[model samples]
Target: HGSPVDICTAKPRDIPMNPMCIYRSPEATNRRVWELSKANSRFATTFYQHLADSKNDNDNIFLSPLSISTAFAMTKLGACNDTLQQLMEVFKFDTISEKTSDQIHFFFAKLNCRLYRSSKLVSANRLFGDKSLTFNETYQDISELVYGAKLQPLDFKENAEQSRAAINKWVSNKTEGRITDVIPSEAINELTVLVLVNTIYFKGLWKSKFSPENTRKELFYKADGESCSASMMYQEGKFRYRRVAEGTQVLELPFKGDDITMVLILPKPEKSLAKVEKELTPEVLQEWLDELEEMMLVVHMPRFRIEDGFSLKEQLQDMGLVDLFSPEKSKLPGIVAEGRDDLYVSDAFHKAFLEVNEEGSEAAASTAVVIAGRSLNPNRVTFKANRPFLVFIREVPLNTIIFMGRVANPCV
Candidate 1:
């Protein structure tokens, strides 16, 4: 089903209370934004582990962090000059410089085309520069496209179903059935001007298959310091490994897909994940990956599955998106010339899934196999993951971290 009717009908006078304006005043550091980014990373990581631990034929799956960032960045483009500045402050735009700015602009431009109607498209074309400029060109582009297309009183219901259908179709295609629906039609409202969603799904078989007989129940530690019994998938294989200065052990797991790989990091025996996270920085991650060189190694990973859901409205608000929520006080430019100011984000959601398994016998049969009578001898070793650890799904060519997270308990 698609989004409900009347989501876009609320008008300025109809708004009962002043919406929360995240971008109303000068921007401030949004703790929620930081938390959500971190959470996204963690969720991505866990997704990799799920794939690694599964028995599916999925292989070499990767999602670009840039893609996720792009999705959220598009939504933020609706903010005016003051709001944009505030968002930059919380996101630490100065550190990345213009690169981040360009990405945000590009992301919004593309999203604008997908979300708005014809009239809004003209305004968006102007805001983001010319229609030829690529993605959303300017703030007016996003505001006009989102506000004018569906949220305006005259056009609300007609487009709500269309918007929901588009999002559902995109999510269904991207997640490969793992995520059935992300947008609930009933949730859309007149204040809900924009919606952005992202999902990643993967299934891969391990090079070395784990014996079903080897699976066993193991104790897993949780963030709350509680422990639970989990059915851990186990296998043994030779892998490349290295130790960092801080006692973090890194392991690489290659997928049949060839170009994509999963990276795992284990803290020293006595360290907790929290401690490791505190010391982990973008610079440190770069250095760690750079230092990795191929070598003979042993690998152990836990077999578990995890699902995480997050609502980013509060988080985005903390990240300097306050103005969009306030119906009365917000002075959003380009959204409306005058009259009804009803506009706000109803919800923001994200979901991801993955599975891992051993390469099939048919795949093995295709390869040359030496018979016992042959002079050549073949040596074989197996690899299986049966321990608690961290996982990262990365696109090596793009040098992007698509997903990163830890699996404390898989059964839950």
Candidate 2:
């Protein structure tokens, strides 16, 4: 293990967040969000390669870049001086040329709020710290406002087991039991300092769902010319389809809503996955996505489930975030007091679960930062945010605020 990486400070509103929020799908595709997705894409590509290169072809490769980035972005909030720059650099963020520091924080807060107006999609953040450590109030405030992160004091010394269980419980509850036991027992001890966690759960139904009756056992070819029989589902819809020069096909499968999509990448000859993976980058991804055209094509894919767990210390170090794990190199002054000894990241872990079937997908992912001292869019046609419609009844004559409340379900 090595060293690693707020809501606005407003009174709790007596309003249901569902109807009080807004879900503007087009707005979510703005420049900042586009850039943020690019950053995550780059991170995910490298991370996927790291895991895939080491594991067998049969093993699954998945990383919740959203969860990972959010957790580290929260930790970066507590980092100062060079430590902060290093964190941003690893995430592909330019703190120097980009908007001021505050802009970045508010941007994420706004981004999360904007996209997660739907109850079906949940993105949450939390921090658990050892009871012996006295965290700075300013740091806490910023984290809450900018990241909507909830901070809680944990008795790591007295109730280490309970603390770990509680963190795991929170993750499970947020993911609807899809992701349980996020932090293993061996990962924690009395000496563990701080932990930052991010969890996201998503459930979406396909606009054009596959038929279970049509599903059959099909041959899944392995890299070495071997094959295994697996359940494969077939669906044909007017999806955004693109065939690249490399003969790699990209299919944009829209969830029931016109607001969200899952882009499936498949090799035409079935032997170009490695080559396509090598060419995977943010810009390359963006270029290919931009060229998509909606067309009617038969889509056949395996119904699969993937559960992935990762320890990111070595991979992050290899990615140029070396000093964070080293106690001597990192100065996490924001988390602790002026002279309460230095802090560094002790370990980092991430677990992700995903299932794809005839109907749609159910996915959940979590990233936990163990500290010691330290998307888009579109076919020509469709969307994905399961959200409540806003409701505000006002006085017509004066155009003034008479009453304001929320409506979680318009039909009910």
Candidate 3:
């Protein structure tokens, strides 16, 4: 949430569509949107898994269903004129129930109209058939007509501050102040329409919380094979664990909510963290999670804090999402009718914060319950993560990795 707009706008020229106008109308065919949607979904899932593998911390994760929905809004903009026609082609309108497909179709239409108004991509008539609908009316109409739900219209303009505050508050509350603030107001543009929003917050007390009295300084290996002293959070509890080839070790830490848990994997002694990253994917991660069994594990996790930020335009491009961001050469159809016009993505930013402590109320205290049978007995074990280490926060039922990061230095 920390103002990924900067990341989005950083390289508009690097986007694949024309720079002078919105995406080309010709390419905005339903066939193309459907293909892109499938690809984007895969990309999003893969990205989350890569992040999870990088962060051995399972409690560190993020996901906003609204964000995914909004991404789809943008994707739909790539196909405007024949919205329903295109949706049917991509989502298999014939296979899905008419009610469900219709709901999705109208939802996209309303969202597309909103985008047109905010971005000024088309005339008012294009968005609302002759009679223009007020924002609130539009929201209500869509809710009742399409979703069969009652929801308030999100006034981004009047509620910009509220939206910003809500997002920041959620991030802060979830991270237990580790992430003091995540939203940047400047990132919110008048034309910035939010098509969707989803958030996952978690705070888990180690089955065996680390005792401050037992905390000791220890050496952590660096990427260069160097070592540094770090304040390691130590605790030994029966944990479900395993070792793959090399020095990679896998460990599972159950949350108070049995519904979800965090998984940690440490790479082999001689291998760089990159090796593990290369092997991470949605299929592999799903398989890994399935392999977990309730077994006693003696785990010693380091007590450290790390904050990091990332610009994903390049990384996403490397991951095969090249056309969405490039301004100079992209063939994004349905976004705009004007060819040769540039409508490139400017930025894609991601930021996260985390902490591990024993006493005061943690973020997940409300939802977690301290169960007795599965609890691990406290013992002493040393874990020093002075070098770069990866962490991931996953919500099990959804099979979603909400937050993921690499802490290069805890002291920093």
Candidate 4:
């Protein structure tokens, strides 16, 4: 006999509200951003750990968790009941300030505004649905306003290749040509009803730039115990450094604007990179950063580039987002105007690119979550990354991980 709860005061257990709920004040908006940032960081580490477990020992991992989250968030805009709950829990949206899944879009509205305020940083979200489907008006409104993504109709039934080309072209344009193809030919077929995409790009110079003259040929040891000649870059400067009791080194290098930084975690023994990976958590990472002190030391790391693609359906299912991909169990009733609740996610794809040199780094990543039917830097204090190490690019103000990966071998 309980009545509908007010959108402004509803908690996670109370009746969930759909569409937008205006923040009562600017202070409330900022508070939501603060809470959501922490939640996003938590999601980042958890997602990375899963990838670590599933990937090969020598595989180079690079991805933008923010992009994947954003794409999923867009799909969440139209999700109903169980599917909604799965998205909320998987995204960690239930742990945020508002506690209700519907209000998470409000947090995204403010976060995107602050994120896009920077010039060289770009984040974009888009939705492409079958031209024959009738999209719900409220879904379109909230998607455009809160998520800042517009749903464009594409004739996937008649023109699958053309739709694939158009979608890839849009991602390429948004990423400054760093990511050109997120969707392949077979990924889009006549059965494809919806496609959600998120792209993020960043290019920044280092504050204490490494000298190109100091770059020389050196041997880079791989995880497989193989050695390859690498163009190792060197620098000597006062920078943040931490040596953990567990035989690991932590280093932070700020970019030119100081709003972003690259964090490097290196294990002392060349073989224990997996140990560092196993023990890393958000709490541990924060502790390491807090204990870091400025010190002058020599640094040596290889000039490297990484590009990888992921078919994320299995990983997401393994993460307990199962209903989202199930054709029989899934329900996204709010998306179709005519109440055609047959929609379910069919597949998901992610691709990322990163390059590091003496000058700086440029990174681009794109993620696509198709809803057809069912489904960092550097160091000091004699710190050398001549072996496998973890890298994380973070935005300073929000402490959000913009990108993350590992450098197994530079020459590959």
How well does each candidate superpose onto the true structure, as a TM-score? 0.53, 0.69, 0.50, 0.77
Residues 1-412 of candidate 3 have per-residue lDDT tens digits of 4533121123223323211112221223354233333333345555654444434431334443223443333334324445634533433332322332323434343333332220011211111111122434433343333222333344456556665665566456544565555556665534545422222234556545568987778776655455567777666766666665565676777566543456777776555555566566556655666665556655655666655443333333344554345443334444565643445555555444555677644333223322111211221222434445555555444443434545444531
lDDT of 1 at 158: 49
Instruction: Residues 28-85, candidate 4: write the lDDT tens digits.
Output: 2377777777778888888887787778767889999888888888887777767777
> Cα lDDT of all candidates, in order?
0.46, 0.60, 0.44, 0.78
**Of models 2 and 3, which has the larger lDDT?**
2
Ranking by TM-score: 4, 2, 1, 3
TM-score for candidate 3, please give it: 0.50
Please list the residue runs of candidate 3 whose C-alpha ends up more than 4 Å from where it truly belongs after superposition.
Answer: 1-45, 48-133, 136-181, 189-197, 224-227, 293-297, 309-318, 321-387
| Model 2, C-alpha of 145: deviation from truth (Å) | 1.5
Q: In TM-score terms, which candidate is top? A: 4
Query: What count of clashes does model 1 give?
Result: 43
C-alpha root-mean-square deviation, candidate 3: 21.7
- Please give, for residues 315-385, the per-residue lDDT of candidate 2 as tens digits: 67654565466564455767766754457777899999999999999999999987784211222111221
